[PDB]
């Protein structure tokens, strides 16, 4: 085994490799939304910018798990990144609702990864998940929730409300 | 009695202690509104900021009466601070209307406190009430009144008007 | 339930609402001490400043729990804030001893809240309590303990020692 | 009568002339204390500085009444300024207690002057007394009261406590 490995269970190592793929997949979803909102027949530059940034952050999240894997002496195994579930995301509200659902799915996976680390008595992994992932996930979910509510207030259908709310994200 | 006390009537001293509790209560009401408007299903950051600031100012108002009590040689007696009348404040318009009603109730109490000081021939207390409280109360009531009118103009129901007016308070 | 809520147990939500009331109560205790020490017949400006700052920090602590409640999708319920246990706090030493006892009571409640979060497998809540509350509570208790010892050294009775120690807190 | 005089009663004009003499007398008392505390066998430079400043402020107070008299069209009449009641003021505590008694005597006279202005329906004079004199008098009395308490705490007799408290006034 690796000269650095210590108190790092095979199951944690494998679960990290799957979370890497999930972070890369979410980055890919957000990239698809981002350029969907730059179509000439959608033209929502605030939504585009918001999802482009979310795409970058998710790819950074994947890289932090890749650095982590190497740090503990695990070995990174990357799988194919699935095509996004959709090619068209509808209105801003529907994209946000899809992002909300995706963020809570990522959160579920992260909490299961914390349970695996806790079960294998890995406080260093539980610390990483709490400090770097669980905290950021809850803030993201709250922020997307706020945005959904604000957009429902402003007028969620393809109208003046969507146009004005889009300016808030620019 | 206190080495500093002079021309300070027992009734003024007791009325100050009650106004302290009322200022602390109003600060508590505004704190409740402030974080109500940060709920993920309300998401009105301008209203939240406005009431958070009003909460701070009211607690400062209480402290100025506490400094005053000590300055005149009275003795501060603090009572329990009642729970806010509501836990949910509805729309921005309903919160402003509730704030308007509360501000005029505080004003009434302050004018009664001025009558007590005037009846006991305490020009130093009448000066404090006129310079530090009555002036600020009338400006607050006018400002809340303007805001109610502006919100009724923009569209007081949970719609684009409320969303846009909220930006004016950020 | 809230669109953001996930892995947030009813018991944690209710325990947060009680800790909010406790933080607000401690803020109220410290406010009472602060202006007690500004009485013309006490005149300990260092103690006054120390407890005024502690009053502000506790009210900030309550607000961080209120932000937290909203972040997780819980609903804030504020109760009445009890009158402070005392209206007069005696000497500086007796106020510090009362603060020490209060700080350890708050700490106990926070450790019970950590046990509730741990029992319901909420690592996000355990992280908040460890990073934002437990750490600050232990430092506060150590600092108050140091101060009690320093004051007992300088001379805890209403004398030159209390007067000099008070300068250290200004 | 003066081309400027309007709503200025003979009694208010005469009462101002007496308050001028009283302010000048208090300035003279404080000047005596100030240089008493610079005697080689007293040597309390903090007390000296405190009373020298109080002497200057009282003489400024007299001048503000003299400017006021002229402003309203009254005519200034200055009487002899009595010798201070004492030539030696004892300890710092006894000087502060004498200042406290003098400040409350000045306050009494000012409140009687407010009653005279109120009885003659002179809101301009009541405003001057509230804004320029009553406010400053209550703050002075509170500050002297604090100082007496601090000195009694530090040790009011000619000892280390008096020596240390004196440094606080430098
Ligand atoms: Fe992520
Ligand atoms: Fe107020
Ligand atoms: Fe706290
Ligand atoms: Fe004066
Ligand atoms: Ni995110
Ligand atoms: Ni639609
Ligand atoms: Ni619709
Ligand atoms: Ni106000
Ligand atoms: Ni409505
Ligand atoms: Ni309508
Ligand atoms: Ni603390
Ligand atoms: Ni004692
Ligand atoms: Ni002893
Ligand atoms: Ni003065
Ligand atoms: Ni003596
Ligand atoms: Ni003695």
* DSSP-derived secondary structure for chain A: --TT--S--HHHHHHHHHHHHHHHHHHHHHHHHHHHTTSTTT--HHHHHHHHHHHHHHHHHHHHHHHHHHHHT------PPPPPS-S---SHHHHHHHHHHHHHHHHHHHHHHHHHHHHTT-HHHHHHIIIIIIHHHHHHHHHHHHHHHHHHHH--STTHHHHHHHHHH-
**DSSP SS3 for C82:** coil
> CA-CA distance, D48 to D54, in Å (whole number)?
10
**C127 close contact with A: CB closer than 8 A:** yes
> CA-CA distance, D11 to D119, in Å (whole number)?
10
* Interchain proximity B40–C4, CB inside 8 Å: yes
Closest CA relative to residue A37, chosen from A154, A150, A166: A166
Size of interface B-D (CB pairs under 8 A): 36
Cβ(D51)–Cβ(D37) under 8 Å? yes
List CB-based neighbours of ion ligand 9 within 5 Å: B 157
**D127 close contact with C: CB closer than 8 A:** no
Instruction: Say which residue the tokens 């600050």 belong to.
Output: C136
The helix (run of H) or strand (run of E) holding residue B19 is helix B10-36
Cβ(D161)–Cβ(C163) under 8 Å? yes
> CA-CA distance, D138 to D146, in Å (whole number)?
12
Neighbours of B132 (CB within 10 A): 15
DSSP state letters, B81-134: BPPPS-S---SHHHHHHHHHHHHHHHHHHHHHHHHHHHHTT-HHHHHHIIIIII
> CA-CA distance, C4 to B159, in Å (whole number)?
22
Instruction: Tell me how far the alpha carbon of residue B128 lies from the centroid of ligand 4, in angstroms.
Output: 19
Neighbours of D136 (CB within 10 A): 14
Cβ(A164)–Cβ(A170) under 8 Å? no
In sequence order, the β-bridge partners of residue B81 are C81
* Interchain proximity C4–A142, CB inside 8 Å: yes
Cβ(B84)–Cβ(B28) under 8 Å? yes
Distances (CA, A) of A37 to A150, A166, D30, D106: 19, 11, 79, 77
Closest CA relative to residue C47, chosen from C98, C106, C96: C96
Instruction: Say which residue the tokens 């009283």 belong to.
Output: D22
- Measured between beta carbons, the chain D residues lying within 8 angstroms of B3 are 100, 145, 148
Give the list of residues 6+ apart from residue A113 with CB closer than 8 angstroms, or none.
Answer: A12, A15, A16, A19, A125, A129
For the D1-170 domain, the top CATH level (class) is mainly alpha
Closest CA relative to residue C136, chosen from C97, C94, C99, C103: C103
Query: Shortest CB distance from C40 goes to which of D145, D154, D155?
Result: D145
> CA-CA distance, A93 to A154, in Å (whole number)?
11
- Measured between beta carbons, the chain B residues lying within 8 angstroms of D114 are 123
Cβ(A28)–Cβ(A142) under 8 Å? no
User: In the structure encoding, which two tokens stand for residue D126, read together?
Assistant: 């009541």
State which approach was used to obtain the coordinates.
X-ray
Distances (CA, A) of D87 to B143, C131, D82, D144: 59, 65, 13, 21
> CA-CA distance, D98 to D80, in Å (whole number)?
22
Cβ(D129)–Cβ(D114) under 8 Å? yes
Minimal C-alpha gap between A69 and chain B (Å): 35
User: In the structure encoding, which two tokens stand for residue B99, read together?
Assistant: 């704030």
Distances (CA, A) of A136 to A132, B124, C10, D14: 7, 55, 22, 76
Is A103 annotated as belonging to a binding site?
yes
Cβ(C123)–Cβ(A123) under 8 Å? no
Kindly give the residue spans of alpha helices, DSSP state H, lying in D9-79: 10-36, 45-72
* Interchain proximity C163–D154, CB inside 8 Å: yes
How big, in percent rounded to 5, are the helix, strand and coil portions of chain D?
A: 75, 0, 25
Distances (CA, A) of D43 to A132, B39, B97, B98: 65, 65, 64, 63
| Maximum pairwise Cα distance, chain D | 61
Closest CA relative to residue D42, chosen from D100, D97, D89: D89
**A164 close contact with B: CB closer than 8 A:** yes
> CA-CA distance, A42 to A48, in Å (whole number)?
10
Q: Is the dihedral of CA D66, D70, D73, D79 positive or negative?
A: positive
DSSP C81: B
CA C13 from centre of chain: 20
Cβ(C81)–Cβ(C28) under 8 Å? yes
Instruction: Tell me how far the alpha carbon of residue B3 lies from the centroid of ligand 15, in angstroms.
Output: 19
Closest CA relative to residue A138, chosen from C118, B42, C122: C122
> CA-CA distance, B56 to D120, in Å (whole number)?
42
Domain boundaries, chain B: 1-170
> CA-CA distance, C120 to C122, in Å (whole number)?
6
> CA-CA distance, A116 to A128, in Å (whole number)?
13
Cβ(B21)–Cβ(B79) under 8 Å? yes
Neighbours of A119 (CB within 10 A): 11
Minimal C-alpha gap between C93 and chain A (Å): 40
> CA-CA distance, A1 to D69, in Å (whole number)?
98
Cβ(D151)–Cβ(D169) under 8 Å? no
**D109 close contact with B: CB closer than 8 A:** no
> CA-CA distance, B102 to B168, in Å (whole number)?
22
> CA-CA distance, A153 to D122, in Å (whole number)?
57
Breaks in chain C after (C-N > 2.5 angstroms)? none
> CA-CA distance, C69 to C63, in Å (whole number)?
10
DSSP B38: T
Cβ(A70)–Cβ(A76) under 8 Å? yes
> CA-CA distance, B1 to B72, in Å (whole number)?
11
**B3 close contact with D: CB closer than 8 A:** yes
Angle at A110 between CA C69 and CA C63, to 5 degrees: 15
> CA-CA distance, D113 to D117, in Å (whole number)?
6
**C63 close contact with B: CB closer than 8 A:** yes
Give the list of residues 6+ apart from residue B125 with CB closer than 8 angstroms, or none.
Answer: B8, B12, B72, B113, B117
User: In the structure encoding, which two tokens stand for residue C13, read together?
Assistant: 């939500």
């Amino acid at each position: 085994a690796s000269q650095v490995r210590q108190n790092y269970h095979e199951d944690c190592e494998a679960s990290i490799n799957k979370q890497i793929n999930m972070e890369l997949y979410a980055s890919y979803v957000y990239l698809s939304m981002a350029y969907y909102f730059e179509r000439d027949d959608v033209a929502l530059p605030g939504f585009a910018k918001f999802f482009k940034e979310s795409s970058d952050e998710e790819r950074e999240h994947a890289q932090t798990f890749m650095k982590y894997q190497n740090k503990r002496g695990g070995r990174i195994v990357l799988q194919q990144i699935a095509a996004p579930s959709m090619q068209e995301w509808g209105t801003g509200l529907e994209a946000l609702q899809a992002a909300l659902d995706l963020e809570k799915q990522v959160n579920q996976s992260l909490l299961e990864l914390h349970s695996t680390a806790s079960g294998n008595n890995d406080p260093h992994l539980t610390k990483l998940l709490e400090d770097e992932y669980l905290e950021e996930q809850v803030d993201s979910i709250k922020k997307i929730g706020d945005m959904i509510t604000k957009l429902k207030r402003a007028g969620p259908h393809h109208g003046l409300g969507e146009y004005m709310f889009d300016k808030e994200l620019n």
